[PDB]
Design a protein around this ligand. Structure first.
Ligand code: HEM
Ligand code: HEM
Ligand code: HEM
Ligand code: HEM
Lengths: 151, 149, 149, 151
């Protein structure tokens, strides 16, 4: 697999790390709200994803759906985990591998997992406003690609 | 679950003690997770057989699956602590967490094996800032998960 | 100085704004310091003259002396934020940092050059969570140092 | 060359980072009190330090001396600075070099700078309680030694 290669490449790329941490500083202000936003956007641009999340019930109901809420919050702590791993290759690798197993068990493939990038962009536009920059999206895409490699 | 949540969230003292102890643990999230798991398997080796995917769990940080698990577990604690000001949030986070453990055949009684390991972890990491009320706070929080299982 | 301290420590709105903005900035202490220094020299190029020990301050992270300075500056901000519960702490911390700037012949007016650079740094790093009151909070904190200079 | 060697060794030593961060969790609960304690211990065991700290006035007054409080708090953020630099060699080196410049300006020799280790040990023991260990002292001493190589 390319997990080791891509994990090493992310940890050694100071440019990208800066963009990840700066934007995470904004995304993490409201963990629940931002998690729910990411998921809302996912379901809007990948309607095929809705069925995969059937355990959650009405995935369009946002904060009024307790299971979607718990899911969306927990998703944001997975991203916090990744962000806190950006200075240690073997740490990043092992947490990526952990979450890959979670997704493998739901038959989520690499390109399926990639469907989060558009949602991340829309969420970054909402959260960054006039300071939005596409280079940050590319930074998140690079991190997402480490997980994709593990799937 | 609602009543167990309220025992924690309705107590200023429990919330304060969870928050201050979490402050200390958060100085090293990875080491917290590894120590808690080490204490679990040392004090309660009976629980080792629940962990069939993680390889040799006694190898600690050198076992990458155990390491990934231990780190991620500590972010679940982070999430619980960050949920204290909103009972409905703590509820939905604990309910999700409970599904994960039910899927691994963990009962409330089994989950309670963590209490003494947690107390030892708290004592070791907090030094002279430990008090028994801190252990009480974490036992109450573990009680929320037990109520959900 | 006392009046300026009371304006900060006595206002829950100022304290809450300093704390929530610091929450964001602390996601990357080093990057915050480097961005603040970049904005200082960009929005107030007249201030470059004071920092010639650091060499080419325009080089950012690659300039190790600038980097070391920027990191230390950001921990000074961290210190201010952790001084909000005790006006006497804020006073003595401000007085300490004032001593240093008095000895570099930095006047109150000169020190105030940081305010617009800080405002732009806050906008850039907080996104939609920025508010004018956040900049006001940081200006009030800078005002304590200005009163001591 | 020597600062680089020692800084690279700190960044390469994971076990030592664990000891630093664990002990930091206790030292940083009460930054002000711990700083004052560290300084008190320094003045106890180094008579000469009082003279070097003449600006601070009557240091025997401890927490009732405002100049000593301001200093002692700042010292603790300098230790936070070290703790936050353990995964980035160029970061650690620039932090150390800045510390060295400051202490050179205040006529502090390498031997004088090393007077902090005993005080740290006593402070660590006061805070770590039944879980003090000698190895944690050596971990802090490694950081002190990087600065000593620069002085
Ligand atoms: C940044 C991107 C993503 C992160 C960090 C992430 C993280 C997570 C986490 C932590 C869980 C809970 C795992 C468990 O408890 O077993 C989860 C569940 C899940 N994820 Fe993701 N995920 C991401 C993107 C996606 C995408 C794009 C899809 C599909 C299009 C996906 C499909 C799922 C499914 C089906 C579940 C199980 C839901 C359930 O029934 O509870 N994930 N994800
Ligand atoms: C404070 C206490 C605990 C916390 C915060 C915790 C948290 C977690 C988390 C977040 C996961 C990953 C869930 C997933 O991705 O599917 C996990 C997995 C697991 N937990 Fe716990 N847990 C705790 C105590 C226990 C105890 C006491 C047991 C057994 C008696 C237990 C048995 C398991 C098992 C078997 C897994 C699956 C491991 C794997 O293969 O990934 N947990 N735990
Ligand atoms: C919030 C605003 C500011 C804070 C908290 C601050 C804090 C500091 C700190 C902590 C140091 C390093 C002291 C040490 O050596 O350990 C420093 C150095 C310095 N500051 Fe500031 N400062 C601020 C704004 C300014 C501004 C606006 C100027 C000039 C207009 C200024 C001029 C200097 C100079 C000349 C040095 C010495 C740099 C050197 O040669 O190493 N400061 N400041
Ligand atoms: C871990 C060890 C140490 C660290 C990280 C450290 C860090 C610092 C810092 C950050 C300052 C404030 C600099 C400024 O604002 O200009 C300072 C001031 C000072 N340090 Fe240290 N220091 C350490 C050990 C020592 C020791 C052992 C001595 C003497 C025996 C010493 C003597 C001084 C003196 C004389 C000042 C100036 C005090 C004043 O008048 O404000 N330092 N130190």
């Amino acid at each position: 697999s390319r997990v080791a290669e891509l994990a090493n490449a992310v940890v050694s790329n100071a440019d990208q790390k800066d963009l990840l941490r700066m934007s995470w500083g904004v995304l993490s202000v409201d963990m629940e709200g931002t998690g729910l936003m990411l998921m809302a956007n996912l379901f809007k641009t990948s309607p095929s994803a809705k069925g995969k999340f059937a355990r959650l019930g009405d995935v369009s109901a946002g904060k009024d759906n307790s299971k979607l809420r718990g899911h969306s919050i927990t998703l944001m702590y997975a991203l916090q985990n990744f962000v806190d791993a950006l200075d240690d290759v073997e740490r990043l690798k092992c947490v990526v591998e952990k979450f890959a197993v979670n997704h493998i068990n739901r038959q989520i493939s690499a390109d399926e997992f990639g469907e989060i990038v558009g949602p991340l962009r829309q969420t970054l536009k909402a959260r960054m406003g006039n300071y939005f920059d596409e280079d940050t999206v590319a930074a998140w895409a690079s991190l997402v690609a480490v997980v994709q490699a593990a799937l | 679950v609602d009543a167990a949540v309220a025992k924690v969230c309705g107590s200023e003292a429990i919330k304060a003690n969870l928050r201050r102890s979490w402050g200390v643990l958060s100085a090293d999230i990875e080491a917290t997770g590894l120590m808690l798991m080490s204490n679990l398997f040392t004090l309660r080796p009976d629980t080792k057989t629940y962990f069939t995917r993680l390889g040799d769990v006694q190898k600690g940080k050198a076992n990458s699956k155990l390491r990934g698990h231990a780190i991620t577990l500590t972010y679940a604690l982070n999430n619980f602590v960050d949920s204290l000001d909103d009972p409905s949030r703590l509820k939905c986070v604990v309910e999700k967490f409970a599904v994960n453990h039910i899927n691994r055949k963990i009962s409330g009684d089994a989950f309670g094996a963590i209490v003494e390991p947690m107390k030892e972890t708290l004592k070791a990491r907090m030094g002279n800032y430990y008090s028994d009320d801190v252990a009480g706070a974490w036992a109450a929080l573990v009680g929320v998960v037990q109520a959900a299982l």
